[PDB]
Write a protein that binds this DNA or RNA. Structure first.
Ligand code: CA
Ligand code: MG
Ligand code: MG
Length: 430
DNA sequence: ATTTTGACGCT
DNA sequence: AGCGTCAAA
């Protein structure tokens, strides 16, 4: 009752760019705008692997991970943009730079946590308090929320999408208590007003559209974001959680899409997030561990305390290349040449990072995969990163992995290498 | 023969 | 430290 926390103490948004790499390429090449199109890496093997897909192309069934040759079977007029190749490998610089554009705009509004190349969490609690003080009891107009959905509405006693959106928004705003500055629902609504402004700023200043979720915590904000993509935002209130979770597959909640979620389903014999409420906290801890159990117990009630971390920059800078099938590296010269290629890209990126962000990486992580291992990485070794020099870094990586070559012949490498990975970590101020 | 990333937990 | 899990485009 009066002491039960309800996880309504914060306003958190999650902003996620729509079909991000596709929008970067469509900005650059107007011929691709408003077309079925996809972004592809490499071309010789089956036309290249698709990594991003416009919504027009998704209508034909094109998805990520599809070979372009296969996507063309579903969508013969599919347009393609290729990821840049430098030093023999795909190079994602253009997308990293576009990400910085968006992250810098979002940081004007609030502290952000960079969650991926195209998404960030925003802690809006303080901005909301400020805006409520500015508003001075003034009601919030639907015109301030032109792209907002209120999850769960309309309800109770138009057949077009925008009509339904407005009906739900009208029901929500008609029922708000705008004179109570401590009302969580009002706080979320002001949060959504701010996110409309942030999304408008992103589109105005970059050309890129995005979706967003607004709720009381990161997990619900992320879930909310996906409910009405693209180019829309969704408010998930605390009160919407029971109905929302009553038919929500467990795997849809962030962190439950893999083995742990599968085990929750198998061990407990349930399917939907809401079914978790019938277990005690101790029961959940007994199956999934102390941390996961407490997290599940609160999360299924819509409560999560994970903070929006103040971190706009990536914590690592890495470069990786697979060598599948017959292309596996089987000679020492090959291994050294590709380590050099990777180290040269890494050096370029590190030097730019040092100039932009006043920091230096101090550890180099080398990871490899040998033919015949189901795991992504077969071996990982670290060494000191003391100089931003590609030849030194490639030599040091070779030194730390050379003992993996079983082959009695110095010139031959066995078992062949199917992946090389260099990652700069452990940044210190500079 | 998706590939190329990036964060964080476990022991 | 090295390995594993989960998640982005
Ligand atoms: Ca996205
Ligand atoms: Mg994303
Ligand atoms: Mg995606």
């Amino acid at each position: 009752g009066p002491h039960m926390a309800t996880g309504q103490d914060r306003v958190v948004a999650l902003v996620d760019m729509d079909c991000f790499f596709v929008q970067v390429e469509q900005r650059q090449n107007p011929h691709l705008r408003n077309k079925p199109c996809a972004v592809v890496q490499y071309k010789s093997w089956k036309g290249g692997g698709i990594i991003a897909v416009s919504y027009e192309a998704r209508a034909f069934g094109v998805t990520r991970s599809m070979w372009a040759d296969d996507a063309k079977k579903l969508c013969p007029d599919l347009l393609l943009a290729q990821v840049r190749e430098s030093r023999g490998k795909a190079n994602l610089t253009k997308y990293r730079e576009a990400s910085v554009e968006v992250m810098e705009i979002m940081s004007r509004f609030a502290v952000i946590e960079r969650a991926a190349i195209d998404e960030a969490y925003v802690d809006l609690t303080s901005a909301v308090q400020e805006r409520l003080q500015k508003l001075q009891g003034q009601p919030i107009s639907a015109d301030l929320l032109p792209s907002t959905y209120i999850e769960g509405l309309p309800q109770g006693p138009t057949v077009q999408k925008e009509g339904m959106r407005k009906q739900g928004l009208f029901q929500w705003l008609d029922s708000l208590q705008i004179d109570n500055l401590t009302s969580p629902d009002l706080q979320l609504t002001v949060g959504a007003v701010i996110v409309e402004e942030m999304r408008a700023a992103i589109e105005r200043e970059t050309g890129f559209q995005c979706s967003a979720g607004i709720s009381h915590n990161k997990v619900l904000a992320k879930l909310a974001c996906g409910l009405n993509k693209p180019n829309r935002q969704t408010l998930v209130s605390h009160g919407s959680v029971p109905q929302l979770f009553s038919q929500m597959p467990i795997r849809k909640i962030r962190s439950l899409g893999g083995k742990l979620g599968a085990s929750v389903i198998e061990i407990l014999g349930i399917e939907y997030m809401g079914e978790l409420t019938q277990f005690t906290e101790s029961q959940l801890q007994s199956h999934f561990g102390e941390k996961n159990g407490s997290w599940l117990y609160a999360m299924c009630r819509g409560i999560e305390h994970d903070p929006v971390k103040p971190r706009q920059l990536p914590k690592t800078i890495g470069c990786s290349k697979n060598f599948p099938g017959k292309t596996a590296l089987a000679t020492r010269e090959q291994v050294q040449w590709w380590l050099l290629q990777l180290a040269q890209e890494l050096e370029e990126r590190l030097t730019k990072d040092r100039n932009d962000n006043d920091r230096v990486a101090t550890q180099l992580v080398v990871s490899i995969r040998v033919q015949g291992d189901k795991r992504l990485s077969s071996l990982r070794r670290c060494c000191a990163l003391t100089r931003y020099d590609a030849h030194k870094m490639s030599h040091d990586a070779f030194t730390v992995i050379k003992n993996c070559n079983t082959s009695g012949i110095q010139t031959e490498w066995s078992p062949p290498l199917t992946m090389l990975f260099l990652c700069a970590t452990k940044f210190s101020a500079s």
